[PDB]
Write a protein that binds this ligand. Structure first.
Ligand code: A1CGG
Ligand code: A1CGG
Lengths: 522, 520
């Protein structure tokens, strides 16, 4: 009782932008109705929160209610649907009547898809009755009454379309997987009572906890604390403090439930990691950054920003790292979609998730798998064709066979600019080598400049693999020396020499000429 | 009190339809004697359909309040949320009270809930309520003055028995508003909001594409909220929404009617594209004369040919020409594309055209459909198209060879028009129209560019012009970061743009089209 009435914004983690949105949408209207009524802002009536399970979207409504001083009423879908025919209707009606009786109030309908699934899923007559009663109650909320209905679901498609119309649920907020900062916030919240040793660095755990949601991180802390019992099992109880090794063990064996869900975050890849050419850097900056950062010039000179690119070139890491870097430059969200993912209605969903994030780079890797000289490609054409050119969403394609791409996806207004990504030059190769080996020690004798001079035409994967091989050899001698017995603390020159013998190339001039002729034809 | 005060002025975006409903539902219910004497039978069922968010839910109440009739409201969800017998009791009571208080209007909001397609309604009570509605509808005597109005998203969702003669014969589509309708909606929604002196709602109306009235209300709310943001008793009094707030709201609005087809008179004129005088005269003959001079057509007893297949090099002039000819005649323009059809929608499109007596139905990328289900479905619908109705079909294909010889028969599209590369005058017009919105330097001579640019397609010219502005923006930022050093697009920008300009149609393609023309 007391605990639930004392959770606020600090006790919810992983959603800080959405939390600010909801604060502005709800708390301010319910604290100063006079101002909004005077200026003429209509407070929202229905807010549908959706996202993967375990994201903490079940606490947002209660946090807002507690921090705004508004009466909070909770409706559980399973609880309503577990009652008899008339009792469920009575409970819904009583919920809304009580909310109106004491206002301002917030009504939270957990698992809305249980009460109001798609009409096809519903088979009986009582279920349609409860859906219709919910619609009637929603439409019965006067603009004066200060009742805001908040609903939680996994996918809004699972809810009956009649509920998502205007006046019932017109605002939808997605509370998705948290980023590194969100994961760190969640870990701090969950470790508020667990005693931790002096060697815990929650930042590393947050950075390495990919595909984790709030619920998963709670399990990770529980598992890490459990092992501290195993190793150590009054004085024993007092000497218990979770250690970094326990956290690493827990993270290694944890199966996150959100590995397959697309991520939307600003990538941590900069220009220096990849290097790149000045021409391509300037071109990408012109195409993307200026519309986002300098719209005044654009409107002044009255041009519509062209918002489509088709990266084409050799097949390595070149095109995707460039897209992530340009996204990082503008602090814009990055959405990466591969051909296999699309091949396996989802096109509209991905475009909607792009439109939700205003500055966004939508990457379509392996575009050839879809656009080739049938249902999916038409969907991509129509969805992108009906994309307003005044919205800061940039669609960046990528294909290693630019001659198999149909002309429909290159028709101006869809993707009107083609950029070539050549084999990295000497400076680019130096940058790639340094970036790959940053997280490993290198003997002072090893000179990356000479290696870059020797490596001509090696693709990005090659340099990564050359580094992996030279390292893989280092582990072998480390074990071999250990078995014989830090005899080998650094990756000396000999390791790179013997790792630079059976590495020849991955794409020779034989296929470079293909792209270099395609360039001349364009 | 507030509901009873709603009138015609309080609904926006449906001026034509509201005039139609006026002539259908007010003049009769106000002067029954005249209509009875002449022999006009007032309608008994009117089904208003369209996208959500429109004022189609308020048309019935406006008509009731302005005609003095008694208004009764039936909600689909409310009726269907009751028990087995209470739903029928409510419907019967509604109709009985309407008959008692005649003249009256019965509005059934969300008819699809009460009477969805019979494939649905797996239960037995739902069929009972649908049959009760049908029985009540058939029970309205012609002498009684009860008019039943209904609202739905798509009439296909309603039971086909409800849409017969005598139940719901008339069907009015209240759809996405045009620029004037959007301006009316904005004026209605901003009657209480305080507006600054620097706000001109015409621009907002023009730029708010795919916006229904609800979206415009949301836009106004967001603009006011951003004013509150930027500014947070004197503070209360010093709040006035500003043009910047409206532009922000437009920028970050997500309208719900982007994917819905538009039916409006395009704002494209001949001067924006030029075109050959031959093509202009031919299009005039085919389209304008039947619409503007039908007496002569009847006099000479010649049935006008309805159909053209524009063929030529890819670009924009096959679509802009259709828009221009539609604009000349103030006729509606419907633009369909191959991607849309590939994904019976054809009958729906043809009905949305037949609804508008004068129209120009444009089928772009026709090669995709023609050379199996769709093409035959497209052929049959046109073959069943009366030649005396002012619906013109204007196809457009960039590869006139792959098109089957079936679409090109003399009841179907029976005329071929060639749209060549724009001549010098056409290029001058295209260049001038493209940069009408961009401040140009007085030194630039578009005539010289037109002389130099030979064979460049419409897209090419637009791209050449876009590059010239891209150079201008870069120089503006470069000067700004170094520091209006670059107020206008100078000649040098155009020179740089031309330096790497490339023709988009090879002379081989021009020769191929010339050979095809010689074939005809
Ligand atoms: C780097 C590469 C990537 O994501 N994909 C990729 C695609 C194709 C490919 O072929 C090779 C190859 N290299 C050498 C010899 C033979 C072959 C087939 N490597 C690749 C790699 C990357 C991008 C983003 N993040 C991490 C890595
Ligand atoms: C103009 C054109 C349009 O709507 N579509 C279109 C079709 C084909 C096409 O090819 C190019 C092109 N141009 C230069 C080089 C390469 C290519 C493939 N551009 C287009 C454009 C238009 C009509 C109506 N409203 C606005 C624009």
């Amino acid at each position: 009782e007391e605990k639930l009435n004392e959770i606020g914004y600090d006790d919810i983690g992983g959603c800080r932008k959405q939390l600010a949105q909801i604060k502005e949408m709800v708390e301010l209207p319910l604290r100063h109705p006079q101002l909004f009524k005077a200026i003429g802002v209509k407070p929202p009536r229905g807010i549908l929160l959706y996202g993967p399970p375990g994201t903490g979207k079940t606490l947002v409504a209660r946090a807002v209610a507690n921090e705004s001083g508004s009466f909070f009423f909770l409706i559980n879908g399973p609880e309503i649907m577990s009652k008899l025919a008339g009792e469920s209707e009575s409970n819904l009606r009583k919920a809304f009547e009580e909310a109106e009786k004491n206002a301002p109030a917030i009504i939270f309908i957990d698992e809305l898809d249980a009460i109001a699934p798609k009409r096809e899923k519903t088979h009986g007559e009582v279920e349609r009755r409860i859906v219709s009663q919910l619609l009637t109650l929603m439409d019965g909320l006067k603009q004066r009454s200060h009742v805001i209905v908040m609903a939680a679901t996994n996918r809004p498609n699972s809810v009956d379309p009649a509920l998502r119309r205007f006046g019932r649920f017109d605002r939808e907020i997605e509370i998705g997987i948290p980023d590194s900062i969100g994961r760190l916030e969640i870990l701090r919240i969950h470790t508020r009572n667990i005693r931790l040793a002096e060697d815990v660095e929650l930042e590393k755990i947050a950075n390495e906890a990919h595909g984790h949601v709030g619920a998963d991180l709670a399990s990770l802390c529980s598992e890490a604390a459990l092992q501290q019992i195993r190793n150590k099992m009054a004085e024993v109880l007092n000497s218990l403090a979770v250690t970094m090794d326990d956290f690493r063990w827990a993270l290694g064996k944890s199966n996150p439930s959100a590995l397959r869900e697309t991520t939307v975050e600003v990538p941590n890849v900069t220009w220096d990691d990849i290097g790149g050419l000045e021409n391509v850097k300037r071109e990408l900056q012109e195409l993307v950054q200026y519309p986002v950062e300098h719209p005044d010039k654009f409107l002044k000179f009255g041009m519509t920003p062209s918002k489509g690119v088709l990266f084409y070139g050799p097949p390595g890491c070149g095109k995707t790292l460039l897209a992530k870097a340009i996204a990082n430059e503008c602090q814009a969200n990055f959405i990466s979609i591969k051909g296999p993912e699309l091949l396996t209605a989802n096109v509209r969903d991905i475009f909607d998730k792009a439109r939700q994030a205003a500055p966004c780079v939508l990457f379509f890797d392996e575009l050839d798998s879809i656009a080739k000289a049938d249902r999916v490609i038409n969907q991509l054409l129509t969805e992108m064709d009906g994309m307003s050119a005044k919205k800061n969403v940039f669609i960046i394609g990528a294909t290693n066979r630019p001659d198999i791409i149909d002309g429909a996806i290159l028709r101006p207004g869809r993707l009107d600019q083609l950029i070539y990504i050549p084999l990295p030059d000497e400076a680019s190769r130096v940058n790639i080598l340094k970036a790959n080996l940053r997280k490993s020690p290198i003997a002072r004798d090893v000179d990356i400049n000479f290696l870059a001079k020797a490596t001509q035409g090696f693709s990005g994967a090659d340099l990564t693999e050359i580094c992996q091989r030279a390292c893989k050899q280092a582990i072998r001698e480390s074990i071999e020396a250990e078995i014989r017995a830090d005899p080998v603390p650094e990756i000396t020159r000999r390791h790179f020499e013997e790792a630079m013998r059976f590495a020849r190339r991955s794409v020779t001039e034989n296929d470079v000429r293909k792209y270099e002729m395609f360039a001349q034809t364009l």
